Design a protein around this motif. Structure first.
Motif, mmCIF file in Angstrom:
data_model
loop_
_atom_site.group_PDB
_atom_site.id
_atom_site.type_symbol
_atom_site.label_atom_id
_atom_site.label_comp_id
_atom_site.label_asym_id
_atom_site.label_seq_id
_atom_site.Cartn_x
_atom_site.Cartn_y
_atom_site.Cartn_z
ATOM 1 N N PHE A 2 42.830 60.165 39.109
ATOM 2 C CA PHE A 2 42.797 58.895 39.812
ATOM 3 C C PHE A 2 43.602 57.836 39.057
ATOM 4 C CE2 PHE A 2 40.283 55.456 37.866
ATOM 5 C CZ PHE A 2 40.057 56.055 36.644
ATOM 6 N N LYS A 3 43.895 56.742 39.762
ATOM 7 C CA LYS A 3 44.475 55.546 39.160
ATOM 8 C C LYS A 3 44.184 54.333 40.036
ATOM 9 C CE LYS A 3 46.085 55.900 35.102
ATOM 10 N NZ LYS A 3 45.410 55.132 34.020
ATOM 11 N N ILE A 4 43.405 53.386 39.516
ATOM 12 C CA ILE A 4 43.014 52.203 40.274
ATOM 13 C C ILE A 4 43.164 50.992 39.366
ATOM 14 C CG2 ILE A 4 41.109 51.029 41.454
ATOM 15 C CD1 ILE A 4 40.085 53.670 42.407
ATOM 16 N N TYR A 5 43.765 49.931 39.901
ATOM 17 C CA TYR A 5 43.964 48.695 39.159
ATOM 18 C C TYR A 5 43.543 47.518 40.028
ATOM 19 C CZ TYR A 5 47.234 51.941 36.882
ATOM 20 O OH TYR A 5 47.817 53.039 36.293
ATOM 21 N N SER A 6 43.100 46.445 39.375
ATOM 22 C CA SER A 6 42.675 45.247 40.083
ATOM 23 C C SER A 6 42.933 44.025 39.213
ATOM 24 C CB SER A 6 41.192 45.310 40.463
ATOM 25 O OG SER A 6 40.376 45.080 39.330
ATOM 26 N N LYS A 7 43.135 42.886 39.873
ATOM 27 C CA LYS A 7 43.309 41.624 39.166
ATOM 28 C C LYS A 7 43.038 40.469 40.119
ATOM 29 C CE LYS A 7 44.034 40.806 35.677
ATOM 30 N NZ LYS A 7 43.060 40.462 34.605
ATOM 31 N N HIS A 8 42.202 39.538 39.668
ATOM 32 C CA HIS A 8 41.842 38.356 40.439
ATOM 33 C C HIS A 8 42.456 37.128 39.785
ATOM 34 C CE1 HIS A 8 39.093 41.397 41.743
ATOM 35 N NE2 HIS A 8 38.299 41.265 40.696
ATOM 36 N N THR A 9 43.116 36.296 40.586
ATOM 37 C CA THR A 9 43.771 35.096 40.089
ATOM 38 C C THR A 9 43.883 34.089 41.222
ATOM 39 O OG1 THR A 9 45.835 34.183 39.188
ATOM 40 C CG2 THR A 9 45.999 36.189 40.521
ATOM 41 N N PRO A 10 43.782 32.795 40.924
ATOM 42 C CA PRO A 10 43.977 31.784 41.967
ATOM 43 C C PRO A 10 45.436 31.693 42.386
ATOM 44 C CG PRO A 10 42.667 30.923 40.138
ATOM 45 C CD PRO A 10 43.276 32.207 39.673
ATOM 46 N N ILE A 11 45.652 31.173 43.590
ATOM 47 C CA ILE A 11 47.000 30.985 44.113
ATOM 48 C C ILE A 11 47.691 29.811 43.428
ATOM 49 C CG2 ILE A 11 48.336 30.352 46.148
ATOM 50 C CD1 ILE A 11 46.165 31.823 47.813
ATOM 51 N N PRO A 14 52.420 34.082 45.152
ATOM 52 C CA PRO A 14 53.174 32.993 44.526
ATOM 53 C C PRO A 14 54.230 33.543 43.573
ATOM 54 C CG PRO A 14 51.080 33.244 43.427
ATOM 55 C CD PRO A 14 51.074 34.230 44.569
ATOM 56 N N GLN A 15 54.950 32.623 42.933
ATOM 57 C CA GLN A 15 55.989 32.971 41.976
ATOM 58 C C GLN A 15 55.452 33.162 40.564
ATOM 59 O OE1 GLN A 15 58.994 33.750 42.868
ATOM 60 N NE2 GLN A 15 58.830 33.101 45.011
ATOM 61 N N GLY A 16 54.134 33.228 40.398
ATOM 62 C CA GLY A 16 53.535 33.436 39.099
ATOM 63 C C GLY A 16 53.644 34.879 38.643
ATOM 64 N N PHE A 17 53.018 35.153 37.502
ATOM 65 C CA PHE A 17 53.034 36.479 36.900
ATOM 66 C C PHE A 17 51.610 36.900 36.574
ATOM 67 C CE2 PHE A 17 55.672 39.801 35.121
ATOM 68 C CZ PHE A 17 54.821 40.443 34.244
ATOM 69 N N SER A 18 51.261 38.131 36.939
ATOM 70 C CA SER A 18 49.939 38.673 36.660
ATOM 71 C C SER A 18 50.047 40.186 36.552
ATOM 72 C CB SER A 18 48.928 38.281 37.743
ATOM 73 O OG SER A 18 48.762 36.875 37.804
ATOM 74 N N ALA A 19 49.272 40.755 35.633
ATOM 75 C CA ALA A 19 49.285 42.185 35.366
ATOM 76 C C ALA A 19 47.977 42.816 35.823
ATOM 77 C CB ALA A 19 49.506 42.464 33.877
ATOM 78 N N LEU A 20 48.086 43.952 36.505
ATOM 79 C CA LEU A 20 46.914 44.680 36.972
ATOM 80 C C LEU A 20 46.296 45.472 35.825
ATOM 81 C CD1 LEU A 20 46.289 44.358 40.056
ATOM 82 C CD2 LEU A 20 48.748 44.174 39.621
ATOM 83 N N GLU A 21 44.978 45.665 35.888
ATOM 84 C CA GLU A 21 44.254 46.324 34.814
ATOM 85 C C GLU A 21 43.401 47.469 35.347
ATOM 86 O OE1 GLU A 21 41.937 43.404 32.783
ATOM 87 O OE2 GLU A 21 43.646 42.110 32.314
ATOM 88 N N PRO A 22 43.265 48.560 34.593
ATOM 89 C CA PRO A 22 42.374 49.645 35.022
ATOM 90 C C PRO A 22 40.923 49.188 35.027
ATOM 91 C CG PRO A 22 43.105 50.001 32.772
ATOM 92 C CD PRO A 22 43.909 48.848 33.300
#
Lengths: 45, 49
Positions: A2-11, A14-22
């Protein structure tokens, strides 16, 4: 494997940057070729 | 119960101590071939899945 990633961030994305995590640990051999989303309502169907 | 060569049964093993001595201790197990690993080192290795 399996491989599942998630990340929660406010809007839209957008042009921002965020990395998904296991997040889970689900070792099971499945030839996954399907994907279904689950919604929610209050009409009681 | 063992399935056929097609639609073969598959079982995942995790969260338990692995003692391989009883496996190859069985007499009828004549055919035991390991790829990428040696039979003598199975009892000392760590596995992720």
């Amino acid at each position: 494997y399996f491989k599942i990633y998630s990340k929660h961030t406010p809007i839209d994305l957008p042009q921002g940057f965020s990395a998904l995590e296991p997040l889970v640990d689900l070792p099971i051999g499945i030839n996954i070729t399907r994907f279904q989303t689950l919604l929610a309502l209050h009409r009681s169907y | 119960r063992f399935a056929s060569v097609y639609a073969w049964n598959r079982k995942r093993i995790s969260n338990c101590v692995a003692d391989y001595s009883v496996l190859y201790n069985f007499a009828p197990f004549f055919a035991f071939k390991c790829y990428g690993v040696s039979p003598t080192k199975l009892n000392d290795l760590c596995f992720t899945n």
